[PDB]
């Protein structure tokens, strides 16, 4: 059982595997993580209008209670499934609009047309706290927040592993979890010492204690899973920059696509505005049809591999 808000997201977790009884179901964190990070990966409100439109088009099926069948995709979705995925979609719509408004996007931008939001480049009201296409200074902040997301996600994931090891009284799942936590905090301390505050007083001791409590797990992981798997853990930590990377890639691509149409409208004006609008529409539709799959797949891939594998799901 689950609360009604987390209920529609059960099909994003039950597809892979079912948990053993007495373990932890990983499903409550999907509706609080996946729509949020998908929305900030997309970071759009112009495409969010298209997502809301296709959600309204899909909701007619659940309104008239008919199955949705596509021959080229070979799927038959019952209304009791279409409703769940529509609920997921308009949950994602809220996050993507609330991050598009702070990325300054309008299926591209209106800031090249009208200064609807303040910026240091075009003065006005209180400016954008995090810009999208300016990678000189926002890149560091976005990468650091992505790394913070990765470390908190991993931390919670194997804190749950330690909890289930404590419940099972095997103590292997507990001591391995504490050791990997120590390795994680040690490598985080080393990464903070690198390209930052060099040789801090409280960093060295924290790193040393983390490395010692990581080495403590040798008495049960002397051969198999102590040495080589810390590289995989570090990779799982560092693989969270794809959020910022996909977000900036999509933002720059959309910006250039609208810039082409804007220059075309500047080129002619009398008739070039409608031709540029049509060209921008068809190009944006083609790019959307190309990249919606990847944009949806990446943040749920993160929750599938970097978070579920911590507690042996």
């Amino acid at each position: 059982d689950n609360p009604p808000w987390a209920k529609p997201f059960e099909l994003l977790v039950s597809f892979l595997n079912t948990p053993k009884y007495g373990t932890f179901d990983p499903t409550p964190v999907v509706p609080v993580f996946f729509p949020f990070w998908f929305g900030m990966i997309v970071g759009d409100i112009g495409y969010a209008l298209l997502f809301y439109l296709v959600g309204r088009w899909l909701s007619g099926y659940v309104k008239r209670n008919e199955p949705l069948v596509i021959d080229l995709f070979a799927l038959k979705l019952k209304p009791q499934v279409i409703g769940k995925l529509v609920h997921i979609l308009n949950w994602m719509v809220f996050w993507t609009v609330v991050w598009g408004v702070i990325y300054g996007e309008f299926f591209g931008t209106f800031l090249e047309h009208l200064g609807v939001f303040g910026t240091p480049e075009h003065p006005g009201l209180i400016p954008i706290l995090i810009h999208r296409i300016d990678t000189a200074k926002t890149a560091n902040l976005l990468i650091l927040l992505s790394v913070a997301f990765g470390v908190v996600l991993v931390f919670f994931g194997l804190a749950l592993r330690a909890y289930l090891g404590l419940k099972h009284r095997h103590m292997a799942h507990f001591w391995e979890g504490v050791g990997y936590l120590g390795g994680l905090v040690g490598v985080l301390a080393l990464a903070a010492s690198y390209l930052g505050n060099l040789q801090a007083g409280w960093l060295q001791g924290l790193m040393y204690l983390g490395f010692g409590v990581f080495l403590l797990a040798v008495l049960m992981s002397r051969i198999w899973l102590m040495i080589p798997e810390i590289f995989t853990q570090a990779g799982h930590i560092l693989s969270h920059i794809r959020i910022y990377a996909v977000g900036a890639a999509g933002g720059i691509l959309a910006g250039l696509l609208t810039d082409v149409g804007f220059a075309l409208a500047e080129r002619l004006g009398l008739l070039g505005v409608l031709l540029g609008l049509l060209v921008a529409g068809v190009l944006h539709l083609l790019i959307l049809l190309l990249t919606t799959l990847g944009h949806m797949l990446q943040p749920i891939r993160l929750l599938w591999v970097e978070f579920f594998t911590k507690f042996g799901f």
């Binding site: 990678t135 000189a136 200074k137 990377a245 900036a248 890639a249 799959l293």
Partner: protein, 74 residues
């Protein structure tokens, strides 16, 4: 922002995106070929084939990440 550096950063970011695209292409070749082989007569495998095809895009993703952080680091 020196002039020679302004072109050398272009060379570096171009190498990054080009070789990342080459790696993703050489992965997606075999992955998509096996996917079409799996949907040739087992059409219910469409979702698995699609997610397996879309999985290695992270290589280009990192490549152009490096590219447009080098663009901002001009």
């Amino acid at each position: 922002s020196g002039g020679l550096d302004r072109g050398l950063i272009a060379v570096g970011m171009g190498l990054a995106v080009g070789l990342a695209a080459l790696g993703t292409g050489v992965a997606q070749a075999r992955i998509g070929a096996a996917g079409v082989g799996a949907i040739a007569e087992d059409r219910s495998n469409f979702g698995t084939a699609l997610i397996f095809l879309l999985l290695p895009e992270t290589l280009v993703i990192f490549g152009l990440l490096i590219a447009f952080i080098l663009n901002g680091r001009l």
